[PDB]
């Protein structure tokens, strides 16, 4: 994931229903400690018998069949951004939520004291903001961190609103220890769906919470 060029970023002013991104990062994520699959639809996904305000079943599509059957029986911890429209879990029964990735083994991945990760925000080429992110997982998913980053920026800097955004472009760059860095565009294509957008989390990319960095790049309208 080699850095993005200005022309490579999505413009927020070009999104008709950007508030459907807002909802995702403005509200609570779906989190579950030590649970194990219960069912499955496609070969690359796992279904859990967990509940939340709007669901009694959770489906998580993973990277591939391999990763799916890899976590199939293990006791995982779940942390993701769920969506409801177009969330086919079965044929009939509903009240199910869907996400991508957000899975990690629960046993021996927790920390005594939460690990704080510094998030260095740069607005208009000027890194003028820094705030902390916290996690208690040794190996955390980029998704978990990405969410925490956006939940903060939305609440404090109005990254997203139920409508337009004050920023035109934006992205988060993950800088792992001895591995290639990568990033996620904060905005979607002019026409999108939560499900199609959230595929950035499907590869279930995990990071060493102790040796990973986070940089955020924003430009105002």
């Amino acid at each position: 994931q080699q850095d993005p060029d200005p022309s490579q970023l999505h413009r927020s002013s070009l999104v008709k229903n950007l508030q459907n991104i807002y909802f995702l990062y403005e509200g609570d994520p779906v989190t579950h400690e030590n649970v194990k699959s219960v069912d499955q639809l496609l070969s690359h996904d796992l279904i859990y018998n967990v509940s939340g305000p709007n669901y009694d079943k959770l489906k998580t599509e993973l990277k591939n069949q391999e990763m799916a059957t890899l976590f199939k029986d293990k006791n995982v911890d779940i942390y993701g951004v769920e969506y409801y429209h177009l969330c086919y879990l079965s044929e009939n029964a509903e009240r199910s939520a869907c996400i991508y990735g957000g899975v990690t083994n629960h046993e021996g991945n927790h920390l005594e004291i939460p690990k704080k990760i510094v998030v260095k925000v740069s607005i208009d080429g000027i890194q003028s903001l820094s705030f902390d992110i916290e996690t208690n997982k040794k190996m955390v998913t980029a998704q978990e961190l990405d969410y925490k980053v956006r939940k903060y920026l939305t609440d404090n800097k109005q990254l997203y609103t139920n409508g337009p955004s004050k920023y035109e472009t934006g992205y988060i760059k993950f800088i792992p220890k001895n591995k290639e860095s990568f990033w996620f565009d904060f905005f979607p294509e002019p026409e999108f769906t939560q499900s199609k957008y959230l595929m950035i989390y499907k590869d279930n990319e995990t990071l060493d919470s102790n040796t990973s960095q986070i940089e955020v790049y924003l430009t105002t309208k």
């Binding site: 909802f23 509200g27 409801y84 939560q194």
Partner: protein, 236 residues
């Protein structure tokens, strides 16, 4: 079933208003429309499901929220007179076409510069014209509510304690009679023989939805809260 709350609302310009829609049909799609005298029913915002909303045809000035399958809210951050209207909510299954939709009871929303114009109604009952009360064979009572504002009222007829819809002839809609004054009327027809029976009881029930607790009214004058006034009368 589809419900809306509030069903009546008077707001001050520049204030925040929140109309709420609750459904029990478990339909994925929910809608928010507005209706304007003479004009049509227009779509403001709608939703394909929880956690998402979509811009309708006249989204400007409105925000929407779909906290869950059952609830769909319409938020008006900065209320303005142009937003005075009758709002309708609706849930929809399948593709969400009209034949697949179910509407709420509607919500009257009136936005004013200040609430000092809001006034309850004057209700009066009238006995049948001496003329018709001979070579008419039918006695017709008239109930008139007027001097009220805004137009958030209901008029119902009750004879002998039980409600009646037969013979009743209420006006389709409150006719405005002045800038800050509405007027509504209704007739109740019965047989002279019935109207002349001292045992029969006629009652015109009128309800006017007025300011609520949430609404702040300048102390000193009586807060024009909701009223349930009734003009009654006996036979002969």
């Amino acid at each position: 079933a589809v419900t809306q709350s509030p069903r009546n609302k008077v707001a001050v310009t520049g204030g925040k208003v929140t109309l709420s829609c609750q459904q029990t049909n478990n339909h994925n799609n929910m809608y928010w429309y507005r209706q304007d005298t003479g004009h049509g029913l227009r779509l403001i915002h709608y939703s394909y499901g929880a956690g998402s909303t979509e811009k309708g045809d006249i989204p400007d000035g409105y925000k929407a929220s779909r906290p869950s399958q059952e609830q769909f809210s319409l938020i008006l951050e900065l209320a303005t007179p142009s937003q005075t209207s009758v709002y309708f909510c609706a849930s929809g299954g399948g593709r969400g076409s009209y034949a697949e939709q179910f509407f709420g009871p509607g919500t009257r929303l009136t936005v004013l510069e200040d609430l000092r114009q809001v006034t309850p109604p004057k209700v009066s009952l009238f006995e049948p014209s001496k003329a018709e009360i001979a070579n008419k064979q039918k006695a017709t009572l008239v109930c008139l509510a007027r001097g009220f504002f805004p137009d958030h009222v209901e008029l119902s007829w009750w004879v002998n304690g039980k409600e009646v819809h037969s013979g009743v002839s209420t006006d389709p809609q409150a006719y405005k009679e002045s800038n800050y004054s509405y007027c509504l009327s209704s007739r109740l027809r019965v047989s002279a023989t019935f109207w002349h029976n001292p045992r029969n009881h006629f009652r015109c029930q009128v309800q006017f939805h007025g300011l609520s607790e949430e609404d702040k009214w300048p102390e000193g004058s009586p807060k024009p809260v909701t009223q349930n006034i009734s003009a009654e009368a006996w036979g002969r």
